[PDB]
Design a protein around this ligand. Structure first.
Ligand SMILES: *[C@@H]1O[C@H](CO)[C@@H](O[C@@H]2O[C@H](CO)[C@@H](O[C@@H]3O[C@H](CO)[C@@H](O)[C@H](O[C@H]4O[C@H](CO)[C@@H](O)[C@H](O)[C@@H]4O)[C@@H]3O)[C@H](O)[C@H]2NC(C)=O)[C@H](O)[C@H]1NC(C)=O
Ligand SMILES: *[C@@H]1O[C@H](CO)[C@@H](O[C@@H]2O[C@H](CO)[C@@H](O[C@@H]3O[C@H](CO)[C@@H](O)[C@H](O[C@H]4O[C@H](CO)[C@@H](O)[C@H](O)[C@@H]4O)[C@@H]3O)[C@H](O)[C@H]2NC(C)=O)[C@H](O)[C@H]1NC(C)=O
Ligand SMILES: *[C@@H]1O[C@H](CO)[C@@H](O[C@@H]2O[C@H](CO)[C@@H](O[C@@H]3O[C@H](CO)[C@@H](O)[C@H](O)[C@@H]3O)[C@H](O)[C@H]2NC(C)=O)[C@H](O)[C@H]1NC(C)=O
Ligand SMILES: *[C@@H]1O[C@H](CO)[C@@H](O[C@@H]2O[C@H](CO)[C@@H](O[C@@H]3O[C@H](CO)[C@@H](O)[C@H](O)[C@@H]3O)[C@H](O)[C@H]2NC(C)=O)[C@H](O)[C@H]1NC(C)=O
Ligand SMILES: O=C(O)CC[C@H](NC(=O)N[C@@H](CCCCNC(=O)c1ccc(I)cc1)C(=O)O)C(=O)O
Ligand SMILES: O=C(O)CC[C@H](NC(=O)N[C@@H](CCCCNC(=O)c1ccc(I)cc1)C(=O)O)C(=O)O
Ligand SMILES: *[C@@H]1O[C@H](CO)[C@@H](O[C@@H]2O[C@H](CO)[C@@H](O)[C@H](O)[C@H]2NC(C)=O)[C@H](O)[C@H]1NC(C)=O
Ligand SMILES: *[C@@H]1O[C@H](CO)[C@@H](O[C@@H]2O[C@H](CO)[C@@H](O)[C@H](O)[C@H]2NC(C)=O)[C@H](O)[C@H]1NC(C)=O
Ligand SMILES: *[C@@H]1O[C@H](CO)[C@@H](O[C@@H]2O[C@H](CO)[C@@H](O)[C@H](O)[C@H]2NC(C)=O)[C@H](O)[C@H]1NC(C)=O
Ligand SMILES: *[C@@H]1O[C@H](CO)[C@@H](O[C@@H]2O[C@H](CO)[C@@H](O)[C@H](O)[C@H]2NC(C)=O)[C@H](O)[C@H]1NC(C)=O
Ligand SMILES: *[C@@H]1O[C@H](CO)[C@@H](O)[C@H](O)[C@H]1NC(C)=O
Ligand SMILES: *[C@@H]1O[C@H](CO)[C@@H](O)[C@H](O)[C@H]1NC(C)=O
Ligand SMILES: *[C@@H]1O[C@H](CO)[C@@H](O)[C@H](O)[C@H]1NC(C)=O
Ligand SMILES: *[C@@H]1O[C@H](CO)[C@@H](O)[C@H](O)[C@H]1NC(C)=O
Ligand SMILES: *[C@@H]1O[C@H](CO)[C@@H](O)[C@H](O)[C@H]1NC(C)=O
Ligand SMILES: *[C@@H]1O[C@H](CO)[C@@H](O)[C@H](O)[C@H]1NC(C)=O
Ligand SMILES: [Ca+2]
Ligand SMILES: [Ca+2]
Ligand SMILES: [Cl-]
Ligand SMILES: [Cl-]
Ligand SMILES: [Zn+2]
Ligand SMILES: [Zn+2]
Ligand SMILES: [Zn+2]
Ligand SMILES: [Zn+2]
Lengths: 694, 694
């Protein structure tokens, strides 16, 4: 038999281990030769594994690199302009590497050049609420200051945006042990914690879905017209650089001015966490000076695209994609995911060699330049947008397979909730203490739904990975799954060695998953999802699950608005249309479900498969959200305050956010009303796609 | 047998005549009770005729009406402010009407109110080139002047836009006998010419595809948020009013200043056609004063939507639509079209009652408020956009069936060229002298293709009718056909009694088509097209015909650019990518055609039917054209200088237009290059939708 069990049993922990080792011996930074060589290797192997075609799709996109002969660093400078302290020029390499070349030093990708000097202000996590506290409550002015912010809580590009709008002239990001050092575990190489010399790389763009900064809307192909740098999308206007906590301690220890406003502003270092501005009495005349010399450069990137043609519906695509480019060795991010995808391709190819083909076409992607802003996936989707929006069934992402060893973490469209529950009930739990129990059982026990008893937590999709263009721009049903930790307040912060030189094969093999059983479990979840999507006769989506969450999101946004009852009275702000639409959606979805259960007729089936495929597509508004034209889904967008987090009813959410501070309340509440209309209309229009067609 | 011949033979000239009479006894102005009553009648009859469902879809949109107790008119005013001449307050009603009430007086719909007074400048047809001649060559300044312009050549809303940008403070439109009085024929009621008291109504909006001015992007339903009037789309900023040639003679006879620059500026009245500004010596102190008091008002409109569910592909829609609202009696515009649609529905219903159903679903529409800016069709399409873009096969328009009695006129997508040629070869010519010959033969003889021997002329779709939203916004294959005159320079001007009170049943029955044989022929062309689209197993589109025209349009836009060889050198302006894309499109389209001819497999068929349906859809750019977000088709848009005319490669065309006058040539040619990239990319992406799917 060639069924899902055949597929799942063919997957081997030992193969994933071998591939992980193979993918993590040298750095694979986007735009470098080593990363092109790995692309060619994967293309060759996917051919050998049995795919019908495997091609490289290349693009020429804006990337950013430090200057090898003019290093970035930060100084404390004295009255005379003597640099009395300098931050490190590189992370101490881990054991046995120390002679690896081409390890890119820590830098903030896309920082402009500059040598700003000034007084420090400490801004906690540099969140919107942190700046509100500084400016509104503490009356501290960041204008012309260098801000220092700890990593964690929100995407770093939002920190930099917030610092810019506060008038900062530079930003220093650092890793506090409060957020990157788990109590009781040892620093790398003796455990999985971040050493004091470790630093988190990462880009600081605010692309809002655009892809390559120079070519928003269109692929960066050979004849592309590029914007000038001054009109590029998303580039920061002030210099930015990341440091480790040994260096941060040196910059923070002398800080003066106001005390931290409360304990949620204090990290774990032995410093006061004074907000500043500037240093205490004796050092009041010393300044901080940044030296940033990185350059932005148009550089070729390569996606590997493999096709397994469907036997029955070859013009319906189920896509499994994850990136290949890494900051350094990519031991977790992304190669723990890429190794899982490699083993999935191998298993599918095994079945194919025995004469099986999936019902629908499966596309496999190894994306490039994810680390520089989701560039590879976005440019490819821009190139192929018409094929994807008329043929795309679903997209399953496959970045890091593990960020912990505790339990499963899933974010996906409501359309896939039932599929995930059903699949996980059929898979074995890899967890100690749940031998012979299902993954569904361990996951539900360890990560209970906050709404429903006996169900696991599944979160909304946000952004910060390659599914963004598929879901938020194109409206293709998307999902992602991995193994995670038990550390709730660190949900968006990353594991301690995130984007550091210390993320190596050895990290994974010694400390995360020595048996590769969690990798195997994740391969079964991702692969199992792809198998069901590409093989089930009726697409495995339950429209009724969308109706349940739409009501939850409508209650939530109504509750936010109802914080302002006098204004809702004055401006006649009614949510009645949105609740009406959600009611209608619930009723129509129930009737559609009955018909779907009640029909030998392939035209009726496909008609109904097309209704299921196009339902996520119906939540797309071609006009986009306000000032964010590439975020087009009306139900979900990346939060405007934190790209990683999803926000529901984002148009209405942002119209309500901080509304009590707007100078013209009539205009502000008018825009809330406009967003309620758009949302109600889109929900009703999506409902109507599920009605009888004629 | 229930085949196309059965359908075509059931259509009767005598029924079309009876329906025309029935639809033209009282005015059916949008938003009035009489037009709602006619909607209800059509809904009832289409039910009786056999459709599966017939519903009214209503919307509340911005309309515009004169003030019944405060009439619009224009005066010549003297030194003291005595009004010494006044234009007419109404057109003399035709015989036997004179006691019809609710005939709306001539006005320009959506004019703002005002009583501007000033000196006249005569601007010929108020085209872009007419204003270029005035300002650049003759150095006449229109700022603060009232302009007087003859109707014809271009859409009146473009005239008003042009007058506004020239700084005019009011616009007077009039009908010159040069353009609205055919030599040798008598004025209504004794012939089909415009009397001197006749006046052409019409709106003067510049909506660029938006639909209701207050709700761009979204249907004007019961909970819609509306823009304030100041932010409405497309409204003119200066008062405008239309007059007949008796009145125009009075305003033009006293005109002084410069002589007309050449004979193409002179109409047929016995006046000099001096450009002005102002009157000759003796009258130099008299002025012209407008009095406009019309009001814009949100008003309910009603579309009738009938469905004939398909037997096999009910989720594929072929749409036959035309409007019902008229300025007055609508003898030609629109009821000559509406009567044809009514007879088509009757014939289809006849077949249905005998047990036949079309393969695909056919939707029939009687649109409202077409005359006020395509409002009914646009709002409906905004409401149903997701259904239309995933299910819409084709749209066939059905406004006026006749504007002459000479030969056929067709505008459609290249995808329908072969369908039109084939259908017309099977229909009888109604023409004298072509008894027993095909319509194809008479049409080709009377309207030869300018490119190809032995083929008839088929023009590009422009705008000015209800197909706009379907074609230019949504990318649904569209076409239109009617009987026309032999008067080439009057292509966009309208027949003489266009939008006048004199367009009556009697006009048609006495002077255009007493036997209703041209109406019947048009019913056979429109109905035959709908039948083939809704019934052919393989959709009747030939992608190779698009490849031929894309090459023609590429040669044309390249030729325009090559007027500027030095700039193409300086700025490295290459059309190579666009010709490459067109070459690829031609090659892939040829191979697709071979496969389409070479395949019992309904999935392969529908897969290939979907490739055919989505090919027009592939030319849509979701970002729209520059500053015209609702014109999204990259190959075709309404000309920026004349809404009625189609323009090919419009983005590149407008970037090139008058480029030698731009102040920053680097920037201007950069934008040409950007538009070449967008066009090349879109053509290649459309080509790729025709490749093998996997
Ligand atoms: C959820 O689905 C339901 C259908 O089950 C759908 O109900 C529709 O609601 C609209 C607006 O609420 C109804 O619109 C009415 O239509 C009638 C004609 O049928 C008009 O006469 C009404 O207008 C009068 O009353 C208005 C309200 O007081 C006045 O403002 C106006 O000036 C008129 O005097 C009104 O337009 C529509 O008929 C129903 N359709 C049904 C019941 O089938 C509802 O809209 C859906 N929700 C959403 C958000 O789409
Ligand atoms: C029409 O269809 C054809 C396919 O039949 C398609 O041809 C493609 O053209 C592109 C660009 O013209 C080719 O791109 C090249 O790809 C190779 C790798 O395969 C690269 O090495 C090339 O880059 C080098 O050379 C460039 C040009 O001198 C340099 O600018 C660059 O720095 C590199 O040194 C280059 O990107 C592509 O391979 C073909 N594909 C084929 C032949 O299958 C053509 O693009 C289509 N037309 C349109 C408008 O899409
Ligand atoms: C996840 O698994 C559940 C449980 O198996 C699936 O739901 C079940 O799906 C089947 C097939 O539609 C349903 O069977 C149907 O029952 C009705 C009688 O009410 C009958 O008319 C049909 O012919 C058919 O037998 C079954 O009721 C349903 N069970 C429940 C509790 O909903 C579900 O579809 C799976 N989700 C997927 C595949 O996304
Ligand atoms: C308009 O009418 C023309 C003429 O009938 C149609 O073109 C013809 O279409 C048929 C069906 O595809 C073609 O027949 C095929 O011929 C090939 C042999 O070359 C064979 O492999 C197929 O099995 C089939 O017999 C025919 O060649 C073709 N004629 C020409 C001159 O092109 C055309 O399709 C009609 N247009 C429509 C329906 O839009
Ligand atoms: O430019 C971008 O948009 C992102 C590029 C790059 N992306 C990442 O590094 N993404 C990492 C980020 C981890 C930290 C935040 N994590 C999450 O949001 C998250 C949420 C749910 C799951 I299941 C898995 C991860 C990842 O998704 O694994 C970056 O964040 O620097
Ligand atoms: O607001 C709008 O966009 C148009 C509203 C209203 N539309 C019309 O009156 N359309 C009339 C206009 C006739 C004059 C221009 N004619 C054409 O462009 C034309 C071209 C091809 C064919 I076949 C038939 C007619 C019509 O299409 O029959 C108007 O022009 O005032
Ligand atoms: C990763 O595995 C690949 C594939 O097994 C290795 O590449 C092969 O190496 C052998 C021996 O040098 C060559 O003969 C083949 O041409 C390579 N195959 C390819 C690239 O498809 C590669 O050596 C491994 N990398 C590491 C670091 O172990
Ligand atoms: C921090 O680094 C700077 C830059 O390399 C050092 O300052 C330089 O020192 C050399 C030799 O003393 C001088 O010739 C340069 O002119 C200095 N450059 C400057 C100030 O930009 C500085 O010594 C380092 N500080 C510490 C504490 O190591
Ligand atoms: C147009 O034709 C319609 C339908 O034949 C006429 O409306 C009918 O009139 C009869 C007699 O008054 C009524 O009993 C029916 O209820 C009407 N049917 C409808 C509206 O569906 C209408 O009278 C005709 N109009 C003109 C001007 O002749
Ligand atoms: C043009 O119409 C205007 C407006 O009705 C006429 O002017 C009015 O005439 C009456 C009676 O003579 C006066 O009471 C009003 O005050 C005038 N209103 C104005 C000037 O706005 C005028 O007589 C008409 N001219 C002609 C030639 O018929
Ligand atoms: C890097 O710095 C070196 C040495 O100071 C300089 O010569 C070169 O221009 C820089 N490289 C860049 C800007 O890419
Ligand atoms: C913040 O500080 C700068 C000092 O240059 C000043 O320009 C800005 O107005 C200040 N903001 C306020 C309103 O405190
Ligand atoms: C793996 O699981 C054990 C047992 O709970 C835990 O103590 C250890 O820290 C985990 N490793 C990681 C990297 O989370
Ligand atoms: C029309 O004019 C009359 C009489 O002058 C006036 O009372 C009324 O306000 C006007 N109607 C409108 C503006 O709709
Ligand atoms: C046209 O005339 C007006 C007179 O008020 C003037 O403001 C404008 O500059 C003139 N245009 C030119 C440049 O001749
Ligand atoms: C109808 O055809 C005749 C014969 O050519 C022509 O003279 C007459 O003017 C036509 N009627 C119209 C309205 O064009
Ligand atoms: Ca791009
Ligand atoms: Ca609208
Ligand atoms: Cl992931
Ligand atoms: Cl028409
Ligand atoms: Zn990653
Ligand atoms: Zn990463
Ligand atoms: Zn019309
Ligand atoms: Zn009209």
């Amino acid at each position: 038999k060639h069924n899902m069990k055949a597929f799942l049993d063919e997957l081997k922990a030992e193969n994933i281990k071998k591939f992980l080792y193979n993918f993590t011996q040298i750095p694979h930074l986007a735009g470098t030769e080593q990363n092109f060589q790995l692309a060619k290797q994967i293309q060759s192997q996917w051919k050998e594994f049995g795919l019908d075609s495997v091609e490289l799709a290349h693009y020429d996109v804006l990337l950013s690199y430090p200057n090898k002969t003019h290093p970035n660093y930060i100084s404390i400078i004295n009255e005379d302009g003597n640099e009395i302290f300098n931050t490190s020029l590189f992370e101490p390499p881990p054991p046995g590497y120390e002679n690896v070349s081409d390890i890119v030093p820590p830098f903030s990708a896309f920082s402009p050049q500059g040598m700003p000097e000034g007084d420090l202000v400490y801004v906690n996590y540099a969140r919107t609420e942190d700046f509100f506290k500084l400016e509104r409550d503490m009356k501290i002015n960041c204008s012309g200051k260098i801000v220092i912010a700890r990593y964690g809580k929100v995407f770093r590009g939002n920190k930099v945006k917030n610092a810019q709008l506060a008038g900062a002239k530079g930003v220093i990001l650092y890793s506090d042990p409060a957020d990157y050092f788990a109590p009781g575990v040892k620093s790398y190489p003796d455990g999985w914690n971040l050493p004091g010399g470790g630093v988190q790389r990462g880009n600081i763009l605010n692309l809002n879905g655009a892809g390559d900064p120079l070519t928003p809307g269109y692929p960066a192909n050979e004849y592309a017209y590029r914007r000038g740098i001054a009109e590029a999308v998303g580039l920061p206007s002030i210099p930015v650089h990341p440091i480790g906590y040994y260096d941060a301690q040196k910059l923070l220890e002398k800080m003066g001015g106001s005390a931290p406003p409360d304990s949620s502003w204090r990290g774990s270092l032995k410093v006061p966490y004074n907000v500043g501005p500037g240093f205490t009495g004796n050092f009041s005349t010393q300044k901080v000076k940044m030296h940033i010399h990185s350059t932005n450069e148009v550089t070729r990137i390569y996606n590997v695209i493999g096709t397994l043609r469907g036997a029955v519906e070859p013009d319906r695509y189920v896509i499994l994609g994850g990136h290949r480019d890494s900051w350094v060795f990519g031991g977790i991010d992304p190669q723990s995911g890429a190794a899982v995808v490699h083993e999935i391709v191998r298993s599918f190819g095994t079945l194919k060699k025995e004469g099986w083909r999936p019902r629908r076409t499966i596309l496999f992607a190894s994306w490039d330049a994810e680390e520089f802003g989701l560039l590879g996936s976005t440019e490819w989707a821009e190139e192929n947008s018409r094929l994807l929006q008329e043929r795309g069934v679903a997209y399953i992402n496959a970045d890091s397979s593990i960020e912990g060893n505790y339990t499963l973490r899933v974010d996906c469209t409501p359309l896939m909730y039932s599929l995930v529950h059903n699949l996980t009930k059929e898979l074995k739990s890899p967890d100690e203490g749940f031998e012979g129990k299902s993954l569904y059982e361990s996951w539900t026990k360890k990560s209970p739904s906050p709404e429903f008893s006996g169900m696991p937590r599944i979160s909304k999709l946000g952004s910060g990975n390659d599914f963004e263009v598929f879901f938020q721009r194109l409206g293709i049903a998307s999902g992602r799954a991995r193994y995670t930790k038990n550390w709730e307040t660190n949900k968006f912060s990353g594991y301690p060695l995130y984007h550091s030189v210390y993320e190596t094969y050895e990290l994974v093999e010694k400390f995360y998953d020595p048996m590769f059983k969690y990798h195997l479990t994740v391969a079964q979840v991702r692969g199992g999802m792809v198998f069901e999507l590409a093989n089930s006769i009726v697409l495995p989506f339950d429209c009724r699950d969308y109706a349940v969450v739409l009501r939850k999101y409508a209650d939530k946004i109504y509750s936010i608005s109802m914080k302002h009852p006098q204004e809702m009275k004055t401006y006649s702000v009614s949510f009645d249309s949105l609740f009406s639409a959600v009611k209608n959606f619930t009723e129509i979805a129930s009737k559609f479900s009955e018909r779907l259960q009640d029909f030998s007729n392939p035209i009726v089936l496909r008609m109904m498969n097309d209704q299921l495929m196009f339902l996520e597509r119906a939540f797309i508004d071609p006009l986009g959200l306000p000032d964010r034209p590439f975020y087009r889904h009306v139900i979900y967008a990346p939060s405007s305050h934190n790209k990683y987090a999803g926000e529901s009813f984002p148009g209405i959410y942002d119209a309500l956010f901080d509304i009590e501070s707007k100078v013209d309340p009539s205009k502000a509440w008018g825009e809330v009303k406009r967003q309620i209309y758009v949302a109600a209309f889109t929900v009703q229009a999506a409902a109507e796609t599920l009605s009888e067609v004629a």
